[PDB]
């Protein structure tokens, strides 16, 4: 992995993560008209404008984040017909996390995968800061929430190469470049019936120790050929996965991938159990 490629990747991901060009204006006069909002934002390129007249708010999509920022700075706390406006970035609507991707899937293949469901607002794989390699998950945000529903639905359980994808909504809880990095991992390819959480969890401590670690027990109350782990930092998970993946244990070589960032061990485990459940 070159360092000019690593940097270009990480760079693209940032441009994407930060192209937040959707703003919210609250405090508008009850009788505000769209013409009024369009006028107010005439120095900007409006891609979309919807005024909730009953709320005195306007949901506006500008050309890009740079314009969003300029609208926010320029009009937040300004006055329109004696009213004080609050201008700020819209909240997260249709933000999905597609995980368990093939570790080799490119950023372009990812866009291709996720783009049909509607127009994308932001789309980025998540790579390791050091290696520059995909962490096996990405994020897709659509212009419409409808689009995210379609996507989750068509992508949860989708086979992509040797993998079965997992999808998970960001409600959204708000992320930072820090939260983009997962603290949880999934171990599968476990031996048939295998029951060494003690051994399995022992194995997984060879670098850092799991704050969480459990087997996938069904409500049958079967055993689902996998396990979920958590680590104190995204960095501790990172190193753990790097060392653990491929390892022999039982008669088999374990596969070790990241879980979508967000949920803690407890939740991911159920989540994954229930997802694979709907078989």
């Amino acid at each position: 992995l070159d360092p000019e490629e690593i940097r270009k990747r990480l760079e693209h991901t940032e441009r994407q993560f930060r192209n937040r060009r959707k703003i919210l204006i609250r405090g508008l006069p009850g009788d505000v008209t769209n013409q009024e909002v369009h006028d107010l934002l005439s120095d900007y390129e409006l891609k979309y404008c919807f005024v909730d007249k009953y709320k005195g708010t306007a949901f506006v999509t500008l050309l890009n984040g740079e314009q969003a920022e300029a609208a926010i700075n320029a009009f937040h706390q300004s006055r329109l017909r004696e009213r004080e406006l609050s201008v700020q970035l819209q909240p997260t609507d249709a933000l999905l996390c597609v995980a368990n991707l093939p570790p080799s899937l490119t950023q372009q293949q990812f866009e291709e995968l996720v783009r049909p469901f509607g127009s994308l607002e932001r789309c980025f794989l998540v790579y390791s800061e050091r290696t520059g390699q995909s962490k096996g998950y990405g994020f897709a945000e659509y212009m419409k929430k409808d689009s995210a529903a379609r996507a989750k639905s068509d992508l949860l359980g989708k086979p992509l190469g040797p993998r079965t994808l997992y999808v998970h909504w960001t409600d959204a809880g708000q992320l930072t470049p820090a939260l983009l990095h997962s603290r949880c991992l999934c171990v599968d390819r476990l031996p048939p019936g295998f029951n060494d959480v003690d051994a399995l969890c022992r194995a997984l401590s060879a670098v850092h120790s799991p704050t969480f670690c459990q087997l996938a027990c069904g409500q049958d109350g079967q055993l689902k050929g996998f396990a979920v782990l958590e680590y104190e930092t995204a960095e501790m998970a990172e190193e753990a996965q790097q060392q653990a993946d491929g390892l022999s244990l039982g008669g088999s070589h374990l596969r070790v991938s990241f879980c979508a960032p967000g949920p803690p061990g407890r939740s991911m485990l159920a989540a994954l159990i229930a997802a694979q459940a709907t078989a």
């Binding site: 006069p29 009850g30 007249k53 009953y54 005195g56 004696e82």
Partner: protein, 182 residues
């Protein structure tokens, strides 16, 4: 247009006022504004009354805002009254023409009081050097004034529509009453 969503946390608003707004909204909503300025103006009043129900709960920039809000509503009611008297003028039914004139010769008064009251409440917004009882009473005068105004205009809508079917032949002024449904 659009229905009025329900309540929540939330939603700091003054409920009786949002209710009054909602009552007007629901009446006007059923109708097209095309060819009907009373309906157009009523819709603006209800949305403005909704904003008022927030402003009155205090906050950043609410004083200037709340005063203008009352002014905006006052201006809109003038149109409703003005237009509602033209209708009464062209109507041949004494009962309706009479309810119509009555239910609307009070509007301008309620409106003026609204400005006066909004302004009082506006001056109180923030100042903690104002008795709780003086502000609460200010709020109450305003809520009650808002209710009359919302009701009065809702009745003007209903009577105007009634008169539409009791207008003189070859009238010089008419309002269009066409549903905005299915």
């Amino acid at each position: 247009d659009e229905e009025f969503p329900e309540q929540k946390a939330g939603e700091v608003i003054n409920q009786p006022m949002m209710m009054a707004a909602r009552q007007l909204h629901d009446e006007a909503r059923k109708w097209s504004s095309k060819g009907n300025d009373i309906i157009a103006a009523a819709k603006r009043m209800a949305l403005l009354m909704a904003e008022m129900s927030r402003l009155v709960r205090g906050g950043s920039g609410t004083k200037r805002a709340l005063i203008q809000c009352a002014k905006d509503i006052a201006k809109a009611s003038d149109e409703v009254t003005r237009l509602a008297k033209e209708v009464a003028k062209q109507c041949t039914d004494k009962r309706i023409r009479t309810n119509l004139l009555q239910v609307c010769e009070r509007i301008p008064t309620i409106s003026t009081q609204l400005k006066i009251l909004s302004t009082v409440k506006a001056t109180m917004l923030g100042r903690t050097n104002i008795s709780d009882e003086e502000s609460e009473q200010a709020t109450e005068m305003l809520v009650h004034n808002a209710q009359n105004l919302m009701q009065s205009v809702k009745e003007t809508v209903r009577e105007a529509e009634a008169a539409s079917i009791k207008i003189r032949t070859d009238a010089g002024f008419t309002l269009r009453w066409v549903r905005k449904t299915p």
